[PDB]
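User: Please run a holo structure prediction.
Assistant: Happy to. Please share the sequence and the ligand.
User: Here you go; the ligand is protoporphyrin IX containing FE.
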Amino acid sequence: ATPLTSLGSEQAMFHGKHQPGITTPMQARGHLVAFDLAAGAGRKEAAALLRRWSDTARRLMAGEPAGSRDTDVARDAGPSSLTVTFGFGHSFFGRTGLEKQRPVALDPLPDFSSDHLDKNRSNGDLWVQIGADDALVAFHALRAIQRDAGAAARVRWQMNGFNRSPGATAHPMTARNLMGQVDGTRNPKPGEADFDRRIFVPEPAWMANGSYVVVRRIRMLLDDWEELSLKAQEDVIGRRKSDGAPLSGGSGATESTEMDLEKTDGSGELVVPINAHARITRPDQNGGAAMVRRPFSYHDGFDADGVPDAGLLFVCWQADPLRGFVPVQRKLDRGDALSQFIRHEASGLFAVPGGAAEGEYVGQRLLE
Amino acid sequence: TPLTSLGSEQAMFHGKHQPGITTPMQARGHLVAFDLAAGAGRKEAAALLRRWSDTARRLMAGEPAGSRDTDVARDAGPSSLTVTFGFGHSFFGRTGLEKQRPVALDPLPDFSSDHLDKNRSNGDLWVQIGADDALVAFHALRAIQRDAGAAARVRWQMNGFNRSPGATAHPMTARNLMGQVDGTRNPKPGEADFDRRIFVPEGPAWMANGSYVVVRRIRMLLDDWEELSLKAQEDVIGRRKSDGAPLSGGSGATESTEMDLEKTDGSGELVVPINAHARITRPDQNGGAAMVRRPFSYHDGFDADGVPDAGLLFVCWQADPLRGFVPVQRKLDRGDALSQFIRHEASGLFAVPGGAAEGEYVGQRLLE
Ligand code: HEM
Ligand code: HEM
């Protein structure tokens, strides 16, 4: 019996080989933020900021207040699986005299033909991912990180997201997105032999045990999507909406049943379409290209014509974007059945170092 | 209490009163207003409320929509979903129902501290959606909005949140983003004068057992608030942040300890300040004016200058605004210590009829 109090009492590790928020389970509430360093903030001011943030992360993740004038917003809650994760944009390095430590992996993402990117709401010197299963715990951490920046950095953009809550379902199971799809079945998992090689930089040296995140604010064209038949929607993905099983499966097939990419109709046509999203994204269709996807859904209102500003805050993790996000998205751009129903409207690519050790701050190897 | 309770708990649709008034607080909220389209009169509004009521009934039972279900809520339990319907002053002129317009919908005063967005205020029709799972809540918002179809457009829509079930080690009163205990003195069904305070009795007959809701989008000036000392913040409310007790209370006092309004300190100054919010808002300071308060917090991001668009979606419930919201806000406008740290930025006043009986729709006695 998992008690209801688990939601609040569950606590994620701040200190680790890897920073939290990568392999951490899905969280109900998410806030992504980018900061740009102030004019005249250099290496010294950035190091001080990262120390402040790391101290704040550490305290909050353990359910402790920030300091004396902590706002009390998270008071009485448990840690609620709070995680805070820090990353560095390509632009950070030129602001701090660290151009020679800028990883080749931060080279800008391609200009994909399907891009519709608000560049103000994209990129940034610094990125912070906050997640928790309690909205006050999450907001408290966002506000404390944002206040820590003070005048030394400014908020460039900031997006809010959500997922299913713990306990929403009778048993824990893969999440859904706002298209109503089972979303998360085929991620690489810790314990798989190639997981570390796929996801983490091995033990420039400041990125040891780090990962590269790609964030994409992807609007779902729900007004078009929701006029489609079940067949049409399922053909876009290649998996069933009911349980996430491959379309190649029978009634007995489940979410775990392997996809049969050769199966055909009586009539000769492939049961899993040739441009289905869950076919064409697989590592075995992309020379081994792989990523961990760990997103939040978003809804930020309606425009004048009733169009919802709703979608997926797509967040993926990889040891090298050129063996993950980039080749896959090159294929998806025009080659994916899903592309017609979505719009990439903001993006970022950030270097996320290893977890801090006792006494350390996140990114200390880089800044020291 | 098992974690699955978050999902399995179910609020009732059918009843003497609509859900979402006395219902416990929920972790996720969507408030939406709609305006009737050209060509939508009384008969089109009745059909709309019939649609909406059927959707609310199904969804509140954890069932899919009756048709074109998106699967977004699939596998989740009801998650304490509630859906609540009301009518604005403007509705009655659009449908030929001017003779049924309650006096209670007469426009709120123009308070000197108002800073209202006219286009995010008011509206013909109001819907309140809340749940403890965000996919359940979004699925209900999207279904209600899609039921509107050609009958009505979305005028405005706001997202809110609260604490999650299980975030605390045992159930406690909510906090808000000012870090205050928020909800202590909310009237409850078993207390002495509750029905007379909150519900139209068995004023136009179609509102029998209904209530009047006042919605205020109140931005919290957190940048100014959070530079105050603890003493200053506690003086603004009249209650302690740590435990919500009256400042007049001793070391043993808790949130429910009765406030002493006459208690002075060693220098003869009142311990609960004369302009403290939790003094001046009490029914006994307002000729018996009272309301149920059942809000959500909001955070919609930052403006270009770093100012959070964050605050309280204040939602209050009363039998008559003239003996609830209106006289209290008249007092608060300039009189309240809190007023300095908030701004009222949107408003709505809606008539929320009684609940639907078995085989009925909400608002039936008005629209048919
Ligand atoms: C809003 C946009 C998107 C939606 C709705 C979506 C939805 C899905 C769904 C339903 C699945 C199948 C179940 C699963 O294995 O998780 C999936 C798998 C996947 N998606 Fe997406 N996706 C989106 C965008 C992206 C993008 C932009 C990328 C990469 C550039 C991506 C990469 C993948 C990968 C790698 C898989 C797993 C492939 C495999 O089976 O091995 N998706 N996606
Ligand atoms: C951002 C805006 C506001 C904040 C932060 C706020 C905060 C609070 C807090 C902390 C309490 C004390 C604990 C409790 O009993 O709930 C309280 C009580 C109350 N507030 Fe507010 N409030 C706000 C706006 C309003 C407005 C606009 C009204 C009515 C016009 C209102 C009416 C009340 C009433 C009636 C009480 C209970 C008084 C009693 O002890 O009988 N508040 N509020």
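Residues B 176, 178, 180-185, 216, 218, 220, 237, 239, 277-278, 281-283, 291, 293, 311-312, 314, 325, 328-329, 332, 342 surround protoporphyrin IX containing FE (ligand 2) (CB under 6 Å).
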